[PDB]
Swiss-Prot record, chains A, B, C, D:
Component of the PRP19-CDC5L complex that forms an integral part of the spliceosome and is required for activating pre-mRNA splicing. Participates in AID/AICDA-mediated somatic hypermutation (SHM) and class-switch recombination (CSR), 2 processes resulting in the production of high-affinity, mutated isotype-switched antibodies. The gene is CTNNBL1. Residues 394-458 form a coiled coil. The modification Phosphoserine is found at S312, S463. It is linked to Immunodeficiency 99 with hypogammaglobulinemia and autoimmune cytopenias: An autosomal recessive immunologic disorder characterized by recurrent sinopulmonary infections appearing in early childhood, B- and T-cell lymphopenia, and progressive severe hypogammaglobulinemia with decreased memory B cells. Patients may develop autoimmune cytopenias, such as thrombocytopenia, or autoimmune features, such as vitiligo. One of its GO terms (molecular function) is enzyme binding. One of its GO terms (biological process) is somatic diversification of immunoglobulins. Pfam families: CTNNBL (PF08216). Keywords: Acetylation, Adaptive immunity, Coiled coil, Cytoplasm, Disease variant, Immunity, mRNA processing, mRNA splicing, Nucleus, Phosphoprotein, Repeat, Spliceosome. InterPro entries: ARM-like, ARM-type_fold, CTNNBL1, CTNNBL1_N. This is Beta-catenin-like protein 1. The surface residues of the concave side of the superhelical ARM repeat region contribute to, but are not essential for NLS binding.
Amino acid sequence: DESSVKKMILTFEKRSYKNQELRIKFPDNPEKFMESELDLNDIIQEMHVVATMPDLYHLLVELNAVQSLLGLLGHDNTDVSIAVVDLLQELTDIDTLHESEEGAEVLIDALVDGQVVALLVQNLERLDESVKEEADGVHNTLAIVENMAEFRPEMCTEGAQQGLLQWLLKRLKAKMPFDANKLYCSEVLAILLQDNDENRELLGELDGIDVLLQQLSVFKRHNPSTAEEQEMMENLFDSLCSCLMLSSNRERFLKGEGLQLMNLMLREKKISRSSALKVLDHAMIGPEGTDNCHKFVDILGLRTIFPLFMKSPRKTTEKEHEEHVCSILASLLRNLRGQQRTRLLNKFTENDSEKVDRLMELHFKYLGAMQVADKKIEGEKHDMVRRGEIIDNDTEEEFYLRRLDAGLFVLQHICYIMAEICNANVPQIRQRVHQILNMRGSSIKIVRHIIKEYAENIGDGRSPEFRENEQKRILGLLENF
Amino acid sequence: DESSVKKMILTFEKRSYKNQELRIKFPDNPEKFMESELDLNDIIQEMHVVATMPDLYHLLVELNAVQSLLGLLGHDNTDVSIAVVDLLQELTDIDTLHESEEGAEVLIDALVDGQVVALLVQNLERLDESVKEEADGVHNTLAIVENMAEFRPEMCTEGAQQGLLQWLLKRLKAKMPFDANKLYCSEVLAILLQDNDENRELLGELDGIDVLLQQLSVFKRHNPSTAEEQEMMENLFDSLCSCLMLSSNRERFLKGEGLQLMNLMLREKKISRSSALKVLDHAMIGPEGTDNCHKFVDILGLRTIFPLFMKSPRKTTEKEHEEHVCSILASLLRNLRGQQRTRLLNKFTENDSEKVDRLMELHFKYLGAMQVADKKIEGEKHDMVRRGEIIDNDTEEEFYLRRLDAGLFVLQHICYIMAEICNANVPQIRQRVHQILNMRGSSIKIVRHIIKEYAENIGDGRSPEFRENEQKRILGLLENF
Amino acid sequence: DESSVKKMILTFEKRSYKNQELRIKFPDNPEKFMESELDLNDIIQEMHVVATMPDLYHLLVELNAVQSLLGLLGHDNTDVSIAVVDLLQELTDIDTLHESEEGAEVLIDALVDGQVVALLVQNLERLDESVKEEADGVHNTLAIVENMAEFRPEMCTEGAQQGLLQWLLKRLKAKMPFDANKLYCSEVLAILLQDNDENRELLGELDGIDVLLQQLSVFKRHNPSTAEEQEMMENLFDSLCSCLMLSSNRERFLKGEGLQLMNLMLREKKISRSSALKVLDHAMIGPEGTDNCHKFVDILGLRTIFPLFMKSPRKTTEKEHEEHVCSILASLLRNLRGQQRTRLLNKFTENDSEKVDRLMELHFKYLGAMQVADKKIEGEKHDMVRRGEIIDNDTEEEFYLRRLDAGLFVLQHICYIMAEICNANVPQIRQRVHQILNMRGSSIKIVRHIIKEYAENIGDGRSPEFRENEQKRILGLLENF
Amino acid sequence: DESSVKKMILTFEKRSYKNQELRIKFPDNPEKFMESELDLNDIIQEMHVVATMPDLYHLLVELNAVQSLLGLLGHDNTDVSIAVVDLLQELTDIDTLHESEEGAEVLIDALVDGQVVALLVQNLERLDESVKEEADGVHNTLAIVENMAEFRPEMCTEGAQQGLLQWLLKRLKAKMPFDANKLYCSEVLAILLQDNDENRELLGELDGIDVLLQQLSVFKRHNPSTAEEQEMMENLFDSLCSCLMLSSNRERFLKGEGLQLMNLMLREKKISRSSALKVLDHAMIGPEGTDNCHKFVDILGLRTIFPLFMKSPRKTTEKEHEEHVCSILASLLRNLRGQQRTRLLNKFTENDSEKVDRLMELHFKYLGAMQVADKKIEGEKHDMVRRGEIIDNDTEEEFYLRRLDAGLFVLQHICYIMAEICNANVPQIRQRVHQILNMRGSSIKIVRHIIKEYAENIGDGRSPEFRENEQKRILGLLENF
């Protein structure tokens, strides 16, 4: 009922106005503003019905309420603020939101204009999670931000650095027992870090990496007791990984003893092992891992990793485990120099080159799978041709996915390792390689082809100069092998 | 098995020794001390059986372990510490403790010598209630202190100021959600304040009063959700009351706006009302309440209290409510001067002296009850005489209790009020009093007698000089009434 | 040279622009922004000449620079900021400022618009007084604010609460050795409190009173070593006094143990005694001193004050000393009730009413002086009439000043004291009074007249209702005396 | 006067006792303890004469005073404490101390027993350098510790970690202006770090390295204004250097961006350049510099250093400058691998191997000097033989000093560099070397000899295993050169 709705908003806006006036005017007592406050509370509650029709979100904007509500977030009393937050949550709830086409956009825009996020942060900075009500408020705020994020992610960057990111770190860092709020915070932080480098940089600046390490480290020598705790842990790990997609952060991770903590996680063999592995991989990946690569060997990483290379936890699937391990190995071979490189190579000569044997075993495994996949793909293509279905970029994407699933990346890594290993002028290794290859009649040629293919697509999101360099380097392995 | 037990202690003490040695010696790695730690943990666990025979608490003292265990509270790693704490708890548990006669005393003495409490405090000061294990540790420590307190309360004073009291305040003050630990802390603090003035003084010094007020004030505009929360609230109130038994603390309470907070609690009419009333009473009681008395009237206390005097919450029993109200009134009449006294008196002239009528109604009610009680007592005495049972001090105590239950104190207060009221040179009041008295044929004489009796026993725990003064003052009321 | 000047501003504004651009663009190195910074520094220095012609302050506003400069206060590097501050100081310097008529107004307005003060505060909040350069910056900022204050004091209120006031308190409170900066801060704070109640309230809120007490208390048991230290002390005292002109602050002073500290200062007899006296007077003055009055007697103030009443430090002049003492006495007589009033009165009965004798001595002294002054005034009036000079409000003001100097206020106070004293139903006092009066043939009548006059002008800056009440009260003294 | 002296100590000890008693007993007022305090103060002052005869330091120990005085450091009031400190200073003053043989030892022992240092630290932790008196106290304490350190340096280790070291860092870190106290602190800290590894480790643990860097960095972009500031800077540098003698600290220095800060100091060319150079050298020296070596090249250290290698600041002497530069180069050649090694080598091929030319120039310079020195030494030896003076270890030490002064170390470094350079399989370099050598007829042989000599004495303070390894390595250079 549209006229009625309109009337109702004015019902609040005046109340909103007058009660402010009351606050301003008569000297500071309960009685002279007090009864206003109850009125305010109840109107807000009533308005919670308003979220059923977002066809009517052209309204709230319309004259006065948007700014007024925002202004109310700083109210001298928490119960107004929390009510406001609640309203926003109901009002902002995506799941009831995503129907309305104009209704969504305007409100969000208004919020952005009013720098809603900053106000929310400010409000938070005065809450007290001892008081159940207040605690609910925090949760509500978090929910609201999640909702906003889902609708329009361009505000993520200014949302963080409106102080939100700094608040999140503080809440994580707080020596409080685990509760839903912490989990929510973790979730939000993770979301904030999805594909956004500015946010990552901000986190790095704020000593966020240190915080992440510390929070994580609990699960080194303990083990989440619940789905909730576990979920939180996972979120944290994800956040860390996201942060690591950025070079500056490699160094921060290094400084914060990230490498040591992940190696301890591996040694411990608790649940965090898989995540730790992933983190390690992320730390080491490109040129920008070199220092991390070198340090890993220094802290005896080789002793932790090669057992994992050799046998994969009876108990994340096996492929993933293999993928990460091999990835790490590849990284090490790319980047390592001096004594650490020598150390690495030595692990390919013990014990009668058993690791080379392992590598070749792996290669055959992956190769067979790849072949199978390839055949299937070919068949599909043929079928498409028969049916006159044109193969476009979506089709190619789909095909790529299949290959990925079969293990393309792992295979590529293996091939790379093999190439680098046979370029070490260590006869024993080379002989073992070639011996093994013809002996079962797979061929150098296949390996070469694979290498070439890998080179072709290397470096997806980086300077063209880089790509050509890397490709060239990889090709150079083929000369002496 | 006693020899076996002996053997077992050495099994630990060496382990305790050697592992320290290990820690000292080989540069700081996991492996060189690490495996020791598991051994240490397990031995401690095993020892937890030892608490079945306290006939064997002459042992642990005996050679080495007591000091060693204490030293272990500061171990570089929390898991040792927590284990130790657990052991202590099992070891110290009263309920399994109070059988052994020598066994109890020695261990406790040893602990005292080693200033166990300080060490515990230190340990606490490095815990992290984010980690469930650590949180358990805190609880365990609290339990241990409770146990110790129950056995030998002479250590309370040095227990507090071994930093324990300061720690407790901090934990209460912490803006964390409510959990068992908070409740435990509250309980412990309350216990610490039982009949011990040094502790109270310490609390006052530490801004403890402020802390207590702040924690309390939540329940002004909210209302405990659980038995646990409610219990905590009650504990807090008790602590506050205990603190208030000491003059210096009156002033701190005043400064901290205690009076205002309790008046708001009264006005609010939530659960905290009864407790608030009690607190108010405690604030106002003697000469040392004068300032509080005067301030109460200043913040319009009279408006809050006289309604409670007039009608007692339909919904602590009625007698208690009446007792506290009348007590407050008595205090006010004793202490109030200047304009506030005038204000107070005015409340006895409206509306046609309705409050005097109320007072006389109350007096008759209490008087009848007292008479009934007295008759019963007389009967009992007679019976005793018949049976040849000699009435001793226990008997008199018992009799006193009966009188207390019937309402002696309230009656006394009422009488005092009546006397002071009729000494105000306000004819209207006096006429109302005397009119009422003969009209129903109870008598001035009875009232006088009551007053005399009150005077007789006044000031239980205070200077003899004071008592004689107060008594004299009270008698002086009888001249002109 | 006006065109040249114009050219010069553009010379900066571009540099200002481009260097920001540089900062924005090339990844964070010295070299790529670094050389810009030197250019920036030097241009600013050059501009320092610009403050010779404020006839050219219509310019800087004109296009770009005002906002740009403000924006530069938050520069990532302190040396820019400090340069900017320096420029502002040179640019804002009153003494070279107050000539230009339009030139002044526009710049100041611009600054206000840009909320210069907030920016300055922010800048301060990142300084480091270890570094001499930075320390100079603080001083410069202080100077600038002083300058601004002198020109347009309407910004004082938002200047404070732009955080400036809070910063000042922090700097005062800092446990650093005494230096010019502290002195400057003190000066500024004092200025801020001149005739501005909002500022006072803010100070009160911020625990400013406590800070002031603490800083002051050093000079209880020590004694400024330099004119600078002494000056600072004086400033602090002034600030305190200013704060005390506001009722809420009475209570804060009370709570902070201000009364105790001033009484200790009196007892100590160091330099701070005069200031302490003044502070005490300010605490006690009106109805709103009642509580302070009562507390003073409680902490044995009477023992400290009556010696000062009796003999005035051989060593602020004597009149001032007398004025303050008598003022305090008057306040006490106005406000005191109960036991404290009795105590006060007792000091007028010892020793054979020697204090009454003292009072009458004082009265005659002041009276003679007043008479002398009055005669002079009359003569002046006569002369004016002869010369045909019309007596207007300025003339009356001038005359009032003369009377004030002669001691009107003190005399009035004395008279008030006498009246209140003779209304105590203490025959001894009354007899002493009247005995003394006729014995030297001055007269009740004169005293009465004086009282009337006092009543006439009482309560200058307060509700008309209040004034009539107070006047009435004062008149009431005349009935029984 | 010995009996008199004895009497005097009792005069205090009772006063010391009784005043404590007074404090204990009568409720907390000025008057009841107050007058005691003045007595206490004056006796202490009087005792200050006692430091003229340390022949009488068998006394103060003797019965009571030592512990009493210590206990007085925690007195409820700073003026007692400061007096005590003053007494200690006078009492402990070395320069008046070092005569007495028994008198010194006993007092110091007593102090140690009473853990004087901890008490002093505690006292400090409650001071307030705003108050001139208090500030003097700090200085006095510092002086006392210096004195104690000079007499018996075995207490340094427990002196630090009695919290003294942590206090020192805090005081350095304090954002206060520069004053004598800071300088004193710097001096003390430096002393504490003289040849004591435990202290260094403690400093490292406490984030001391970070503190040192931060304090230092001021002088990157500024320049001490006074001898005092300069002195402080020097002290800081020394401390840093001392810290760097320990491997763990290399890593802390690295993490704290020490390398970057020293390179900026070099680039800046302010006074701190020499110190920075030294620091760099210390960071890079042995195997334990490898990481630092590698990082230095990463932050473009090569660009900063090789100019210094090439021409030595027109403006520490030239030899020292050369010594440090060459040292750094040597370190780099020892430790560098991978790409950084390549980079380093490239600097020996530009521009037509000008750096090789430079190196050979340097070598000849140093060689001539060495030869001169050697001749002198020979002459001296001959003279000794003639005179029948037996050459012992002192003589050899003396001779070594001469060689050091002439530049042995620098020469050795140069030789090492030459050897490593000619082992790079870079023909151009080798040809340049050998070309140059015979061309002026100095000889490979000499160089070889020098190398051998260097190897002989290498690794002074380290494992014998290490020494043999290093020596072997150095010899290995001689094969291919």
